[PDB]
Design a protein around this nucleic acid. Structure first.
Lengths: 178, 116, 79, 136, 94, 50
RNA sequence: GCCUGGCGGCCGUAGCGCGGUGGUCCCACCUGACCCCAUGCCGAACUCAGAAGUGAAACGCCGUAGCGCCGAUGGUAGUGUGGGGUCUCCCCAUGCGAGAGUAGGGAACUGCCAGGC
RNA sequence: UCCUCCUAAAGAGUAACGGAGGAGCACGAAGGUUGGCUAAUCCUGGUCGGACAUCAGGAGGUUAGUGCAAUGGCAUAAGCC
């Protein structure tokens, strides 16, 4: 593990040179990465969610758990906390464990891209990267590609503005450009 | 908010402890210290005091908030209660679950005679 | 129609007013929900799952200003 | 537009006129119309006033209406006995008292506001009075 | 500066106020300035024709109250829904 | 109702029994529950229909 | 008497919103969770092991009195009780009298206990 | 027949084929409890793609929920686990 150690020394610890604070403890931090994988056309049975979560847990270090629904989804018979997908939310060391597998070894299904925008916005500085699939990691034999399954990513941080979060964006090796 | 979450874990217990009354024992946690006080049935007096801010014991600690220091305070509350003739006490878990430093104090005090 | 029915009684009863009781029991009201307007606080007790307060005491009722969660409550009289 | 909406009840008590009002002076504008009399003021009576006052200020300023109807008039069917529930709606109406201000203007000269509010001294169940902000 | 004469009243309420307004005066008060409130009667039209010129709310007034001078400021005035010659009036000490 | 009743017998060997309306139309797996037996004053399974 | 803490009384006229100040001793954040315990996964939480940093967030105290809240006095609304009216609210005599606004108040207090002074 | 508000007079019952709406069955669970937990709605942003539609962040708050219409307690949750 090297990328979280880079976050402990090389990221925002000199930010007082560019951003105004009353304490050096105000510099921005990463809180969580929620994640999402959609059940798609299996929504009306969804007993496969345990078997889909188990293969997200093949690139994540977390133990699988199943997403409960909110406000229902369409007319598919979704009621209260009905199990409907997977998040398997990342905190602490597990966030950068994943960002040392993502587009380092998990590569053979990526799309044509070269750099995501740094001047992007939400109002707090919480960045996102479009990937659509779990993009596959290579094994000694596979025999693993049939549908690959989905992936969505948006970070959550202590930042109060989009240019404060632009200094925290330094926390990753993913292609972002100024 | 943890100050607010603590009173959500405590109000229901206080709302049955008020139906017992009598001479009562309360505990105060914090992460760097621990304290306890015995309060009178009139609501106007304090009968026994002990803590890890007490100069006699603070010098004996490797850490002023430690579980062993909570048991050491518990054994002192029961000692002082015995010399002051205090019995049949009502215990308050003071917003904390009965396995942490709150129990380490109150159980050690009860095995030192202070029922509860 | 034309409005229909409009049911009988809708019974609701009120006892917790002035120096009520003084013999063996003091009372609140029958209003389907009650926890602070005519309720007990401190060492006083008299209410269960039915939300009608009936406290078992020879103390008369007493009224006083405020109590826990800024609710009004009712108290007992010493003699 | 000049009618109660997002309500849960459709019919109201016929009512008596006892309200004293606090709509007793021009609120945002400079010139207006005061009731200076008592009774019922209908949607029809204010339509007749709107049609009239518009002829003095044909292309001149915005006009504001300070009165609003809160009560519908209900009347029973003709070929039916007493009882069987409250009657069917006809028109919307407001109760009025002498102190109440009904209309406001601002984007015109004071002698053109008078030209419109003197024209309103007609077609109404009260003998209205023209009023203005003044200095005090 | 708008010298008006103020006599002190030891009557109060609806019956007295109606009996006052039926004459040449209407009810008024003076308060503030670390001194008690004072209930007075004032001229029912002189004050209306003065305050209508608005500088009454821009200047310190030369009132004569219980025979004597104190200087006062116009604070607030109470109007009647349809009777133009005032309902009640407030002053504060200067 | 159309959900029917089930009558279960005491595992204390008593003639006194227990009866309930437990619906099978969504949840068909059998009812086999503990209750207080009023003839021996014990907490026993009530089992097997009729 | 004050600084902080716990509690009993008191429970928001201790709420809303914007600052100052300080952590000495308090306190919270914060630090560790290879070894007790714990997580529908997650050291977030619970619990254990703590003093490297912050004084920001929060906290205590105080400041800003615009709002919520208290509140004179006068007046009005309403009406106990008598009497009257071209009239369904309106007048007289006598008792009562809001609510909202104005002056003034208001940004919790205080005893017991250990500790900072 | 049962059941609910307004009208209905600051003690209390209360008329009208007055203003207006429901029940006639379910639940071993939503029951017992120790502990733990805390919305709606509006907004910003979405994907291989949408007749419907993801999880976050921003605003907000006894506005969600309680087996069922209706109202009110409600986090000590009586809401769910």
């Amino acid at each position: 593990a090297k990328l979280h150690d880079y976050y402990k020394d090389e990221v925002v610890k000199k930010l007082m040179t560019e951003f105004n604070y009353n304490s050096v403890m105000q510099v921005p931090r990463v809180e969580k990465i929620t994640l999402n994988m959609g059940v798609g056309e299996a929504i009306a049975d969804k007993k496969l969610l345990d078997n889909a979560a188990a293969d997200l847990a093949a690139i994540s270090g977390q133990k699988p758990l199943i997403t409960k629904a909110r406000k229902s989804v369409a007319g598919f018979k979704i009621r209260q906390g009905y199990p409907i997908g997977c998040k398997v939310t990342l905190r602490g060391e597990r966030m950068w464990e994943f960002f040392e597998r993502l587009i380092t070894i998990a590569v053979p299904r990526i799309r044509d891209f070269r750099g995501l925008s740094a001047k992007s916005f939400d109002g707090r500085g919480n960045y996102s990267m479009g990937v659509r699939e779990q993009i596959i990691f290579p094994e000694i034999d596979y025999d693993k590609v049939d549908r690959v399954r989905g992936l969505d990513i948006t970070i959550t941080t202590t930042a109060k503005s989009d240019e404060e979060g632009r200094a925290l964006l330094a926390a990753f090796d993913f292609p972002f450009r100024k | 908010d943890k100050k607010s979450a603590r009173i959500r874990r405590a109000t229901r217990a206080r709302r049955k402890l008020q139906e017992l009354g009598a001479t009562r024992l309360v505990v105060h946690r914090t992460p760097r210290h621990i304290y306890a006080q015995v309060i009178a049935p009139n609501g106007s007096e304090v009968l026994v005091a002990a803590s890890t801010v007490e100069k006699a014991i603070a010098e004996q600690l490797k850490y002023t908030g430690n579980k062993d220091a909570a048991a050491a305070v518990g054994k002192a509350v029961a000692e002082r209660a015995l010399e002051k003739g205090i019995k049949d006490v009502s215990f308050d878990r003071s917003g904390f679950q009965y396995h942490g430093r709150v129990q380490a104090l109150a159980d050690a005090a009860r095995e030192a005679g202070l029922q509860f | 129609g034309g409005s229909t029915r409009n049911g009988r009684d809708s019974e609701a009863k009120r006892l917790g007013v002035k120096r009520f009781g003084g013999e063996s029991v003091l009372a609140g009201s029958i209003i389907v929900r009650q926890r602070g307007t005519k309720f007990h606080a401190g060492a006083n007790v008299g209410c269960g799952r039915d939300h009608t307060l009936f406290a078992k005491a020879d103390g008369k009722v007493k009224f006083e200003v405020k109590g826990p969660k800024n609710r009004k409550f009712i108290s007992i009289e010493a003699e | 537009m000049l009618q109660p909406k997002r309500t849960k009840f459709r019919k109201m008590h016929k009512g008596r006129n006892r309200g004293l009002a606090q709509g007793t002076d021009v609120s945002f504008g400079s010139f207006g119309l005061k009731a200076v009399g008592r009774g019922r003021l209908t949607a029809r009576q204010i339509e007749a006033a709107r049609r009239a006052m518009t002829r003095a200020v044909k292309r001149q300023g915005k006009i504001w209406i300070r009165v609003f109807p809160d009560k519908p008039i209900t009347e029973k069917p003709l070929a039916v006995r007493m009882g069987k529930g409250k009657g069917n709606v006809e028109y919307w109406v407001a109760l009025i008292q002498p102190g109440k201000v009904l209309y406001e203007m601002d984007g015109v000269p004071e002698e053109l506001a008078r030209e419109a509010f003197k024209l309103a001294a007609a077609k109404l169940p009260i003998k209205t009075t023209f009023v203005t902000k003044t200095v005090m | 500066m708008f010298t008006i004469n103020a006599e002190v009243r030891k009557e109060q309420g609806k019956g007295a106020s109606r009996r006052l307004r039926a004459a040449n005066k209407f009810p008024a008060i003076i308060y503030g300035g670390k001194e008690a409130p004072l209930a007075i009667e004032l001229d029912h039209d002189k004050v209306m024709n003065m305050q209508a010129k608005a500088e009454f709310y821009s200047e310190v007034l030369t009132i004569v109250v219980d025979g004597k001078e104190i200087k006062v400021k116009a604070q607030d005035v109470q109007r009647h829904p349809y009777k133009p010659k005032l309902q009640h009036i407030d002053f504060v000490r200067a | 109702g159309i959900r029917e009743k089930i009558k279960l017998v005491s595992s204390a060997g008593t003639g006194h029994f227990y009866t309930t309306t437990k619906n099978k139309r969504t949840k068909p797996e059998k009812l086999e529950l503990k209750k207080f037996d009023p003839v021996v004053r014990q907490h026993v399974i009530y089992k097997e229909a009729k």
